[PDB]
Amino acid sequence: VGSLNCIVAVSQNMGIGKNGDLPWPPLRNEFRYFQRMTTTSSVEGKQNLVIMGKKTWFSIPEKNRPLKGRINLVLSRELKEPPQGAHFLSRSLDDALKLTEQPELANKVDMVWIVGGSSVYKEAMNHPGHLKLFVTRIMQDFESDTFFPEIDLEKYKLLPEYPGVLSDVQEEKGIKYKFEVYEKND
Ligand SMILES: NC(=O)C1=CN([C@@H]2O[C@H](COP(=O)(O)OP(=O)(O)OC[C@H]3O[C@@H](n4cnc5c(N)ncnc54)[C@H](OP(=O)(O)O)[C@@H]3O)[C@@H](O)[C@H]2O)C=CC1
Ligand SMILES: Nc1nc(=O)c2nc(CNc3ccc(C(=O)N[C@@H](CCC(=O)O)C(=O)O)cc3)cnc2[nH]1
Numbered sequence: 001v002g003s004l005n006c007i008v009a010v011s012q013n014m015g016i017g018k019n020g021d022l023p024w025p026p027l028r029n030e031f032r033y034f035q036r037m038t039t040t041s042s043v044e045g046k047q048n049l050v051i052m053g054k055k056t057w058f059s060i061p062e063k064n065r066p067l068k069g070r071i072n073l074v075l076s077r078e079l080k081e082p083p084q085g086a087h088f089l090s091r092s093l094d095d096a097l098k099l100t101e102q103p104e105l106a107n108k109v110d111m112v113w114i115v116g117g118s119s120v121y122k123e124a125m126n127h128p129g130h131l132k133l134f135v136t137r138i139m140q141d142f143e144s145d146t147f148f149p150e151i152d153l154e155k156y157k158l159l160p161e162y163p164g165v166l167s168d169v170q171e172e173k174g175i176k177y178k179f180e181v182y183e184k185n186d
Helices: 028-039 054-059 093-099 118-126
Strands: 003-010 015-017 047-053 070-075 088-090 109-114 130-138 170-172 175-184
Touching: 003 015, 003 028, 003 118, 028 047, 028 130, 028 170, 047 054, 047 118, 054 070, 070 093, 088 093, 093 118, 109 118, 118 130
Parallel strands: 003 109, 003 130, 047 070, 047 109, 070 088
Antiparallel strands: 130 175, 170 175
C-alpha cells in the first residue's frame, strides 16, 4: 500500500466523540461527503477499504452495517472473528495493510481509508510515506469525551485547495464548518 487516507470531523475543542456517538447533531451533507469520499472508486473491479476500531464499528447504526459499497475491516486484539456483518478482522494496522496483498484481496482493493477512532488515527498519522488527512473543522465548541490528536505541521502541509473538495465555509442546521485537506509525503 503506497498511500493511506484518514477522514475525520472535529470540533474547535478537538472533540470527535461523546457517549459512543458524535458530539454535534447530525449534519446530513457532511455525512454525504464522508460517504462520497470513502466509497468512490473509478477503478473497475475494485472497491475501497475502510479500517476502523471496534467502538467506531458499534457506533455505526446497525441497519447501515457494513458500510455499503466498501470492504469493512475492524481492528481488535480480543475478537475471534469479525463482528457480525464485517468482512475482515486484524490485530493491528500493519496486519490490515498486509492482508490487502494476500490472494483473497489482491485483486480487490483500490483506496484505503482510516475512519477512527483516536488510537487508529494516531498510528496512521505517523505511518511512513504518503498520507492525506481529510479534516472537517466544525467551527464551534461541543462537549466531548474522545479527541483528535494534534496535527504536526513539521510533517503535514495544509493544501490550499483540492480537486472535488469545496473551499468555502458550509452551514447546516445553523452550524458552520469547512473541509480541509492535509498532506505528508515522507
Ligand atoms: N467525529 C468523527 O470523525 C468520528 C467519531 N468517532 C467517535 O469516536 C468514538 C469511538 O472512538 P474511540 O473511543 O477512539 O474507539 P475506537 O474505535 O478506536 O475503538 C477502540 C477499540 O478498537 C480496538 N483497536 C483500536 N486500535 C487498535 C489497534 N491499533 N489494533 C487492534 N485493535 C485496536 C480495540 O478493541 P479491543 O478492545 O477488542 O482490542 C479498542 O479497545 C465514538 O464516540 C464515535 O462516535 C469515531 C470515528 C470518527
Ligand atoms: N468527515 C467525517 N464525518 C463523520 O461524521 C465521520 N464519522 C466517522 C465515524 N462514524 C460514523 C457513523 C456513521 C456512519 C454511516 O452510517 N455512514 C453511512 C451513511 C452516511 C449518510 O448517512 O449519508 C455511509 O454510507 O457512509 C459512518 C461513520 C468517521 N469519520 C468521519 N468523517
